[PDB]
Design a protein around this ligand. Sequence first.
Ligand code: SF4
Ligand SMILES: [Zn+2]
Ligand SMILES: [Zn+2]
Ligand SMILES: [Zn+2]
Lengths: 538, 99, 189, 97, 146, 512, 103
Amino acid sequence: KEQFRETDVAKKISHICFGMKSPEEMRQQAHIQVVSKNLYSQDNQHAPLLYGVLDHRMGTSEKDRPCETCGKNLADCLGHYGYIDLELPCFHVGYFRAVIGILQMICKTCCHIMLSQEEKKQFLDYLKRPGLTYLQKRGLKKKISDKCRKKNICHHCGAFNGTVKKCGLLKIIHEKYKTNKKVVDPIVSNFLQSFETAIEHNKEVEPLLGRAQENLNPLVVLNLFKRIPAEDVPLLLMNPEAGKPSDLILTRLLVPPLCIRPSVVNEDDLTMKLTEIIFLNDVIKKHRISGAKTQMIMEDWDFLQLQCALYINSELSGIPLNMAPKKWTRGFVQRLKGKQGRFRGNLSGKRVDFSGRTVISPDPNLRIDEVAVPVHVAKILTFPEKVNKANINFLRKLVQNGPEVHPGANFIQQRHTQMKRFLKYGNREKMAQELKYGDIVERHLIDGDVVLFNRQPSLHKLSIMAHLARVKPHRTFRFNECVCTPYNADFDGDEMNLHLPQTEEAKAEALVLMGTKANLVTPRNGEPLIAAIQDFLT
Amino acid sequence: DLMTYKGEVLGITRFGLAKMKESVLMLASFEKTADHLFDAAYFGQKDSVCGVSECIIMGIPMNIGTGLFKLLHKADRDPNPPKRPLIFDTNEFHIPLVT
Amino acid sequence: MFVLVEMVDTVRIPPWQFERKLNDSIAEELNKKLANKVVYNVGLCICLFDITKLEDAYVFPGDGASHTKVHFRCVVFHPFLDEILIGKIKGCSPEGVHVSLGFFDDILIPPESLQQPAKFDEAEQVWVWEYETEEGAHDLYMDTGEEIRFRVVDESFVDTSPTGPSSKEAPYTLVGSISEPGLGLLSWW
Amino acid sequence: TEGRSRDGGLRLGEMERDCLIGYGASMLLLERLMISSDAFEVDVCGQCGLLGYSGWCHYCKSSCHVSSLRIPYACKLLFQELQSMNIIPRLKLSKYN
Amino acid sequence: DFESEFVEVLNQQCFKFLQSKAETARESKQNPMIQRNSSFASSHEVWKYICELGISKVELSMEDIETILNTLIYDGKVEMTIIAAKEGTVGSVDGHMKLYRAVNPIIPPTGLVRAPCGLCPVFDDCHEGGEISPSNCIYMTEWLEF
Amino acid sequence: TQAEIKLCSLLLQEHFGEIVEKIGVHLIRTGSQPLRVIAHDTGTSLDQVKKALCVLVQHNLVSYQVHKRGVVEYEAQCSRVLRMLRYPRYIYTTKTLYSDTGELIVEELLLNGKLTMSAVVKKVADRLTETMEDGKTMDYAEVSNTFVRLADTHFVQRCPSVPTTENSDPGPPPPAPTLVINEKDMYLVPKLSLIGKGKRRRSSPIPDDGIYWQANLDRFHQHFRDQAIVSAVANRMDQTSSEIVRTMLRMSEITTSSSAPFTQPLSSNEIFRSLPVGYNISKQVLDQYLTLLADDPLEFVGKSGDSGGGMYVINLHKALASLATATLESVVQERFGSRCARIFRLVLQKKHIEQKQVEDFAMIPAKEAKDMLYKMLSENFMSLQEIPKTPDHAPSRTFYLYTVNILSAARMLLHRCYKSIANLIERRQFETKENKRLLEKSQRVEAIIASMQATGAEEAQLQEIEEMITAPERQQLETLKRNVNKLDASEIQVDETIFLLESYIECTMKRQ
Amino acid sequence: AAYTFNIEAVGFSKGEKLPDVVLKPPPLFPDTDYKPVPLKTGEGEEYMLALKQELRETMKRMPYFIETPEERQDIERYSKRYMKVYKEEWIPDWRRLPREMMP
RNA sequence: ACAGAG
DNA sequence: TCCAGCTCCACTTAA
DNA sequence: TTAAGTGGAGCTGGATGCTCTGT
Ligand code: SF4
Ligand SMILES: [Zn+2]
Ligand SMILES: [Zn+2]
Ligand SMILES: [Zn+2]
């Protein structure tokens, strides 16, 4: 009647493999096409235009108006993509230092790679060895471009290949027709004499034709990169199963879902840059129809290379003065770098809950592995105590006390349910007689719990230890003064942090490893730190 | 011995760490965060999740400390147990027909 | 008509079942996920026959349950092509003869493969058979379900999987024939 | 959130991560920096390595390789800031043995 | 421009005056050395017929038609050879004289323009598995019907 | 070359199969490989690599050279597999110069790759028993008489043959025996006294051992090189001026190489003799043509000599440049209009030009030409030079000169063709994939006609063929066949666009 | 609303005539003004079209066309000798081929 | 964006 | 505010 | 006489401590 299906498909990560998508796999990932520049409609309904940015077929960013692709709210949807088409190709600002690196090693006439045959046989067998590391891939492209840039004639077609260097903000030049004081070559003579038509009506061509070289644009290097042989793509050190050389020039641009850009920041800096790209898709298109000059086309197309480059990285170096930004916007790079980036602000260290911070004050009537948690913090910081055969009659009383009397519980949770019933409302003596084996009582912090204890400049590993909490009525954290040496606290308006673990494994790793009785010596040389201090030595 | 195990004295800079460590996330969670990302996109570089600083980002437990060994369960079990005998399809009664 | 199918799995044994032997608790959990279910390429899985190799029982971090890998053989109803069984009738329709086989119910005896003297009914749901000397055009496959004999000439699988985001057709079909001499009711032969 | 007025909560810094590693506490470092901040699940296609939704991989137009993975949320935020940058973080999953 | 809709009929007018002159050389069939010279038309002689037809009131001057005659080269329809001014009724260029004869195009059109893949504006975006495939294409399925 | 790899995976699919293209395409894609890493980098069994390479070395699609440690590495040929599309153009062009006997000689050489002279004259004698009747047999003798005439005009050449192991390196066997080609006996046939009759398929010790014959695919290209140049001369002037070019090139067959800008110049005193006798032409009229063809600025021919009366040569590479010029302008006129092709010929002659001079020299106004200027740079037909005033290279202080590059637009237009043919093969393999229901339905109703056709065949099986429901279904099957006749014919005609482009690219490559 | 870049650097010196904003996106198949050239017809061009169908019908039946090996057949029976697809086997010339490829 | 505190 | 890579240009040997 | 491999000089791009507490 019914077919099998695996119920809980859990899998572990094995390896992260970076790469890039071709401009026709971006079409296969997204859902809509984005053509409209304007964020919201003209009426009062606060609804976005149905084929633009902020469309709600691309994920949601509020609980009020749900998404349209999968009909779920903010707390359920992963987010969905859209794409923008470009009528002119542009560089991606990250890959631009490797766009030049390929045009130094390939030709610009036959698109083959510039090596002799015995040199090609050496590297293609070097890349067959197992255990090839990332260091041994970066060092190989250094050695191949030392061989390709010393050759200037091709072994397959025979064209001249001058050097390739940067000549401005996202502009690539190619010295094909350099001149010398020697005898004039036949290939430099014919190009320099076929200017006969342009000099007739334009006088200024004649002084300026000594600098005429093949200015390469994204229209050329899109055409050149579609004809690179796939036997010679791995000698560009690109992995051919993660990207093509045609993919480094973008002709179609994905937009992020609204889980990446919130609705009220009103709109995000990466939303405002996607308005300026779509608007310059219709200004450049307008000047193609209504007949503008080439000095207006190449001017407006310099913006589209710029407005995609600052969209990704908004701290470029060589921007001209007529095109520099007036205000500062976050690009994608500036929300990855720095202290308030992802990797230092939200990934390596992140804001946690079940914590507390209060002024400290001394108390020697506790043991050296105890800490006095106030009642106001112990009523808030809770621990999920799973019900089993041992603690059922204890947790019934801790439910019957409730959220106000101190040995109590703030929540309750059934066996296979994911909701929590707030225990202040309803009758508690009915919810205590309806406890089953496997429900979760979230009791208050009581005497004997394992809790961590932190001081904020954390130099060595004894700046954070785990103590056994014991509730006391006054409003400070309190510990014996033998533990003033590891934390380096001094009780003069000094604050310390607290962290209650929430799992049993996190309790046992805090009690055995991070105990105060198991950390009496420093790991540096083996000298005791928890010992007597002033008024216990005098 | 950590500075001199590749035959060269490597620093504790972002240039010595870029020759010791191999993980893209470990290189890009410290300094020059964007350039390692575009370089690993260019080379098609696969990364392992074996190191410490990329287990904390991916939320998997690290390999050092208590994450180096596996705990089994001492279950009362019979591995390779007594099977049930096949009666019809044995080898001695089903010699094939073709020559 | 039964065959064996060999599979692998990872079975979660929760810690409230450690008082019971592992082999007595693996076999119950595998029947809670495979019995009366058609695994796609093999047919209808009745029950487990035996567990053939049982590896070690890891406890992963973040859980108290033990996960073990199980090699096991399942007895599976899958008849080979042109195997002649005995079957019952549930009812009839213009789409064909709907034959029940005990636990299983979706067997097709089509009018394209029925017997040659009678092929199209007289706007009655019940199928007919015409013989000249006795019972002329009034014979009928009775809805009470007497035993017939048929020959499964065609079997075909369909991938019944979710297409589209997740917030009844048969994935195991069977097509037969009755036209051979000796196929039909047991009362005729 | 950030501060006391917003009912903010405290921060495991970049240096208190360096102290929990020195103790070798692996599951306590997991409980502080994954479970008690932003625990989350994602539909990861094991075939191509992208991220799906509701079991439906819109890239492959199929539903036989999706799977669920325990991930932090600020990594799922990272894996979709980077696909907009055309730096595609293609994963490859295996079974969790 | 002088006028767009005015030069579109002079492109239709000069070639009929340049082909039939070659046709009177083609029907002559006497000597291909002389049939070639009977195909060339004088640069002043081609001015004397177009002004005689009387299509527009404005003067079809000699300095204007000398630029109009370049367009029939650029459609691949005539040639142009400059010879020395040894003899002529006018000899409008000092020491030189221009000639014009109509020609056929060089080759028949290639096989790429006979394919629907050649003239398509979304040629680059078409691939196998996605939306725009030749399996579901409008450009072929329209063209394959008639 | 992503289009060439997609097309080679189609040509090896219909003509050789599914488990053989995985070995062939992987050598085009990756490079030179020994036999063990071919199976590892594909995932196939070691037996199937033995089957899929022996077929690809039969048809000479893969080659090999000996390396260090005696390993055998293979290498596929990209251009040689792409010429499997021109197989019907190779069988038809030998039907002109040779009879129906020689039409089936090359057709056995192309389908089987390598054959012996003992075997190829057998099958042509065998397969032409169906084309005759009434006891007349096809004999082995006259097939060889056509075969030795094929080698005289170089349409059939000997393979690079195995050397003699008794003279070179006796002893232990080498893995790859280093095959080598000789210059004398490429066309020196072995003599055959053997004759016989072909069998009519009734269904009821070797002299040329090692001498293998294969088709010369270069000579058909040199034969197609002449018909492109002559027809280009034919359309401009006359049929009488057309034959003079055909007169020199047939004489220029055996005297020049496959890549030469200049052939051997011919004296007109022997041009008059080799010219056919059915033309009413004198020696003086012959010297009338040869001085006016050199006057054409297309410059098909050149003078290049004075001795021996009229000495005359014909250009090859300049002629293919004029053919690639007429190819690159016949695609602009059909895609962007006739008035747009006026501009592409302007920038072709006036080599470097601005916006103001295009609207003057072609009489196409503003806001009508600037659309047709900008849609050609966007399709890579025209390029810019951008001569600067400053080293800042700002767009407000520089000029923009439009410039046509022929050679970069000759490779790109060819790259459009390789994807164009593969899209035609995908459409045909789509409508045949989705309609194997109907063709099997047309197969079964004709199988009643085919099986039991004469032996015990009654007349009570002729009226029951159309009784099945396929009779209104026949409207779709005629729609299916009229699509195939427009797809496969367009599939051949793009090779005409390829060959004019392929010859112009081959003559400008020096291979140094 | 003013944007980050200067619109005056882009253009729009009059201050009006901004380009219109697209509401419904363009279709997948924009219609063309021009159509392809029809096929080259004749008795000489048609015979190449006839033989090309006579190659797919010929080269699929050749012994070079290696068909994929069958597997996972169900059981044995007597209807196998009638259904055995007979096809002769061709041996190559091993004097040309390397030694490393014998079956 | 500034001031504090340890 | 301090510090490694990248690129341009004279400076000898060698033919 | 000059081709070429390697020195020295200027340009370029990156980085600079941890948190709460308020306006
Ligand atoms: S869409 Fe179809 S007809 Fe158009 S170019 Fe692509 S394959 Fe050819
Ligand atoms: Zn959604
Ligand atoms: Zn080159
Ligand atoms: Zn997928």
